[PDB]
Design a protein around this ligand. Structure first.
Ligand SMILES: Cc1cc(C)c(CN2CCc3c(Cl)cc(-c4c(C)noc4C)c(Cl)c3C2=O)c(=O)[nH]1
Ligand SMILES: [Zn+2]
Ligand SMILES: [Zn+2]
Ligand SMILES: [Zn+2]
Ligand SMILES: [Zn+2]
Ligand SMILES: [Zn+2]
Ligand SMILES: [Zn+2]
Ligand SMILES: [Zn+2]
Lengths: 463, 359, 128
């Protein structure tokens, strides 16, 4: 009770006071530190100037011609012009980071608002001689910072389990950070390749530290408290018993109680369902894998035929799933996923700029390297190609209808391979455990030390 | 300050760099050096404004175009050395006592925009480039100690850099609006320096291993709103300029935050105030200070040359004098105080040199 | 073979005692690691406790570079061997368990694993 005109006048008088108060605080805070900064100089510069006193550096002395004049009538000087003998430069290259696998890229304050409130607050108190007529005045003077309500509570103003504050919670709340933030596909947390969050179905098959670990372990173990105990640590085949009673990109499909028919994303997108899909195991659209015995580099093998590498979890027989030891293995069709690239050498091109040379021979159709870079939306590639055209240059390469791989900022050494309409290498995009990747393959045999080329034009027909 | 001479080199090309030799003995004459076109030129300063031409070099290649230089010495010989470089992305170390080009370094994949030697180790050369990277060389053992850049380095041309007084940290600036802190007193870096001194090629078949430091110890795009083209430390505070016609004085972190505790994810900057001036909104115009860091001088796109006195407190009341002269109308690209602050050389877009004297 | 080759990461020329510019046998190039442990720390949304395990797991999965579902079991056994000390010392045993259980709900490891590992860890904690 003082009248709205009055209160809003106070808001202004007070805010304008605090602000001006804090203005001076900092005014000095700065003055303070410019000084305590100066001493720092003095004390250090002296250290340098000492070191320099110790030293005894020879004076520079006087020596095709060069002259120098003087727009102040001083005598023209003339002197011998020495030539520094030529040095060779190398071609232009901008900074890049090394990749071995694609990498995905996407496309009045609170602190004072409170002081003013408590300022106002003390006057409403000092009246008698957290009010509501106050939040209204502040809303009048800063109608943008919100209304009375929105300020009425702005003012008023994810556990851990190894630490002391481990609440007792749901099981789906102890495993939350893990469930959402983990890639069933690369087995990494917050992976660098897969932005879409895993559907719910992709992860289903005392003190809190104890109650939680309980409500969690029962989800996995259920009623075998013999084990629920062994794990929970300090409880018993009993006590737990007692606590008891109280070309389109691929993305996995998750349509429960729906068959993979004409409404399924994978079938619409013209892709095979993969292991990562949450559909039946009977699914008619899953890719079987091959039962080859070895090789897998011909139309004989269904995987190669369908332009897929073998899958280490379906092609159990060709050698693709064993021997995580060598990159030479029975199955010649998993060079990308295991990453068995050939040694490459970088030297100035024989045509232009930088080029790339293979170090050891290579048969027709043999794999040479993956072409790696950042995965970006078709729109990012737009935006970026505007900046790129300046250079009459481009290291964009279509991956599929949804993604482009751009080797400008990051990639691997096969990006130094130059364009030609008469290449000795070619690019084939393959599906590889649910990822489209670009494999660079030789087009004819190739010998020690040859320069590598492929025809950038097809990698540019995303028509 | 009074203007007391003005020189013109015969080539009529912009002079981007000028640097007094701050290693001269007490008693030896004040020598400074100039780069522009494809030339490096030394000058001895004498009394009554006389400036005496000492030496001058020209690059065999006609399309070289030197933007910067820096003075160091050879510990074991007491000879000055002048490093220079420019658009061909090549460093030369010139030995003026002998008139040779004694070393050179190919490596940067584009133009070098600045060069700075280590405050306390004559042999560590930092080079800033249009390839988006810094690079720290060890010029005794001829080894590339470190490339500062990568996934969290500069997204665009790096225009400038500076060691702090003691040689512990570097800050860099460039066309992406960013300034960056790179420590070189981490165990990794000091270890790479030591290791670099040990490298003996004649005793191994393996190329020295260069540190790829992909991550700055601190970053910000919040001081200026445009390419940043000069930066130098003032103590543990930082001075930096863009084209918005003001040198800004700021520190990383919050006001009381200590430069050595600032964490690589700190997202606060604190602006301590700025120096105002006008008509300097073309890019690539650099400032400087004394060895004692009491004087700050900046030149103009139209021949003006400002000099502030850093001794005061606030930037606002910063003592500023504006040196001017009827004949100096060229843009000033860079300035340089003799070590004893007695002299002030400025160089211009038109080959001109202007010498100012104190008292 | 008769030509002048340069290291792809510095552009310095190759002295003859090479060939070999595989300064990118970097299965897990250093920056990708630093990048990942930085990105995890950026969540205001995750205990320092579930972070340090996510960080360590990722570094682990990156170093060896598993690629198949049928490697996960051996990978957990490997995780605890190589990173077991730290999990203990840094007080990250329970979180590590919520990891092991999550990896089950995702259908990667077996139940005989999800404790055959918890065993080997305490069997290691006491070793100190
Ligand atoms: C086959 C082959 C591949 C590569 C990568 C090089 C080296 N090189 C050529 C020159 C070049 C320009 Cl003119 C502009 C950019 C550039 C920036 C910077 N931002 O977008 C682009 C686009 C970049 Cl990256 C480069 C670059 O690195 C080579 O010589 N040959
Ligand atoms: Zn992923
Ligand atoms: Zn489906
Ligand atoms: Zn599917
Ligand atoms: Zn299906
Ligand atoms: Zn097969
Ligand atoms: Zn197969
Ligand atoms: Zn196969």
């Amino acid at each position: 009770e003082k009248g709205p005109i009055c209160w809003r006048k106070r808001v202004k008088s007070e805010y304008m006071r605090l602000r001006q108060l804090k203005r001076f605080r900092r005014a000095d805070e700065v003055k303070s530190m410019f000084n305590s900064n100066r001493q720092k100089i003095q004390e250090r510069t002296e250290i340098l100037n000492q070191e320099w006193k110790q030293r005894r550096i020879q004076p520079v002395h006087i020596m095709r011609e060069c002259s120098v004049t003087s727009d102040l009538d001083f005598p023209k000087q003339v002197i011998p012009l020495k030539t520094l003998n030529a040095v060779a430069s190398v071609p232009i290259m901008y900074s890049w980071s090394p990749l071995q696998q694609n990498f995905m890229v996407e496309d009045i304050n609170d602190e004072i608002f409170v002081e003013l409130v408590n300022a106002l607050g003390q006057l409403d108190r000092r009246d008698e001689k957290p009010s509501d007529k106050i939040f209204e005045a502040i809303s009048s003077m800063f109608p943008d910072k919100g209304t009375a309500e929105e300020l009425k509570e702005k003012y008023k103003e994810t556990p851990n389990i190894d630490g002391p504050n481990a609440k007792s919670v749901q099981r789906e709340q102890s495993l939350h950070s893990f469930h959402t933030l983990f890639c069933r596909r690369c087995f990494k947390y917050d992976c660098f390749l897969h932005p879409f969050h895993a559907t719910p179905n992709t992860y289903k098959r005392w003190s809190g530290a104890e109650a939680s670990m309980f409500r969690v372990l029962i989800g996995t173990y259920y009623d075998n408290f013999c084990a629920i105990a062994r794990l929970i640590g300090t409880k018993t085949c009993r006590q737990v018993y007692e606590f008891r009673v109280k070309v389109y990109n691929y993305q996995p499909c998750d349509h429960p109680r729906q068959p993979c028919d004409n409404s399924c994303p994978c079938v619409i997108a013209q892709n095979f369902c993969e292991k990562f899909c949450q559909c039946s195991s009977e699914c008619q659209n899953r890719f079987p894998g091959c039962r080859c015995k070895a090789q897998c580099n011909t139309k004989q093998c269904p995987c190669y035929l369908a332009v897929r590498e073998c899958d280490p979890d379906l092609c159990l027989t060709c050698g693709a799933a064993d021997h995580w030891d060598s990159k030479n293995v029975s199955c010649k069709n998993c060079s990308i996923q295991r990453g068995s690239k050939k040694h490459l050498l970088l030297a100035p091109s024989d045509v232009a700029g930088w080029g790339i040379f293979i170090k050891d021979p290579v048969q027709k159709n043999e794999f040479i390297s993956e072409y790696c870079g950042e995965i970006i939306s078709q729109d990012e590639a737009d935006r970026r190609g505007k900046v790129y055209d300046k250079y009459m240059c481009s290291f964009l390469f279509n991956l599929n209808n949804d993604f482009v791989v751009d080797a400008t900022r990051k990639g691997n050494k096969i990006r130094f391979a130059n364009h030609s309409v008469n290449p000795n290498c070619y690019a084939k995009v393959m599906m590889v455990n649910g990822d489209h990747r670009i494999g660079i393959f030789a087009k004819r045999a190739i010998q020690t030390g040859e320069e590598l080329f492929f025809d950038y034009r097809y990698s540019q027909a995303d028509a | 300050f009074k203007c007391v001479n003005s020189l013109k080199e015969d080539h009529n090309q912009p002079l981007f760099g000028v640097q007094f030799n701050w290693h001269s003995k007490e008693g030896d004459p004040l020598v400074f050096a100039t780069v522009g076109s494809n030339r490096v030129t030394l000058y001895e300063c004498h009394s009554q404004g006389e400036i005496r031409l000492l030496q001058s070099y020209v690059d065999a290649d006609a399309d070289e175009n030197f933007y910067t230089c820096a003075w160091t010495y050879d510990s074991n010989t007491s000879h000055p050395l002048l490093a220079v470089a420019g658009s061909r992305g090549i460093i030369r170390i010139i030995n003026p006592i002998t008139m040779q080009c004694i070393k050179h370094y190919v490596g940067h994949g584009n133009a070098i925009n600045e060069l700075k030697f280590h405050p306390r180790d004559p042999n560590l050369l930092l080079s800033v480039s249009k390839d988006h990277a810094l690079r720290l060389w060890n010029i005794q053992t001829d080894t590339l100690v470190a490339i500062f850049g990568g996934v969290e380095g500069h997204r665009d041309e790096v225009l400038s850099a500076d060691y702090d007084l003691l040689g512990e940290k570097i800050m860099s600036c460039g066309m992406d609006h960013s300034l960056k802190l790179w420590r070189i007193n981490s165990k990794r870096m000091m270890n790479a320096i030591k290791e670099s001194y040990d490298y003996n090629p004649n005793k191994t078949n393996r190329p020295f291993i260069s540190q790829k430091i992909h991550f700055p110890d601190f970053s910000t795009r919040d001081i200026h709103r445009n390419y940043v083209d000069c930066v130098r430390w003032l103590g543990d505070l930082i001075l930096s300029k863009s084209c918005e016609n003001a040198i800004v004085c700021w520190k990383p972190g919050k006001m009381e935050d200590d430069i050595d505790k600032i964490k690589p994810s700190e997202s606060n900057v604190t602006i301590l105030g700025r120096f105002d001036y006008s008509q300097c909104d073309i890019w690539y115009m650099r400032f400087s200070m004394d060895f004692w860091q009491k004087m700050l001088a900046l030149g103009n796109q139209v021949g003006k040359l400002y000099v502030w006195d850093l001794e005061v407190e606030d930037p606002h009341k910063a003592k500023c004098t504006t040196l001017t002269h009827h004949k100096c109308g060229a843009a000033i690209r860079q300035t340089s105080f003799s070590r004893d602050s007695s002299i002030l050389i400025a160089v211009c877009d038109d080959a001109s040199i202007w010498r100012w004297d104190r008292l | 073979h008769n030509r002048l080759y340069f290291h792809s990461d510095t552009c310095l020329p190759l002295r003859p005692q090479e060939m070999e510019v595989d300064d990118e046998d970097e299965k897990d190039p250093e920056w990708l690691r630093e990048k990942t442990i930085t990105q995890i720390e950026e969540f205001s949304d995750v205990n320092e406790g579930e972070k340090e395990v996510m960080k360590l797991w990722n570094l682990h999965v990156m170093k060896h570079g598993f690629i198949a579902d049928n490697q996960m079991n051996h990978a957990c056994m490997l995780f605890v061997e190589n990173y077991g000390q730290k999990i203990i010392k840094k007080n990250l045993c329970r979180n590590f368990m919520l990891h092991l259980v999550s990896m089950h709900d995702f259908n990667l490891i077996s139940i005989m694993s999800i404790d055959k590992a918890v065993t080997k860890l305490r069997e290691m904690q006491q070793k100190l």
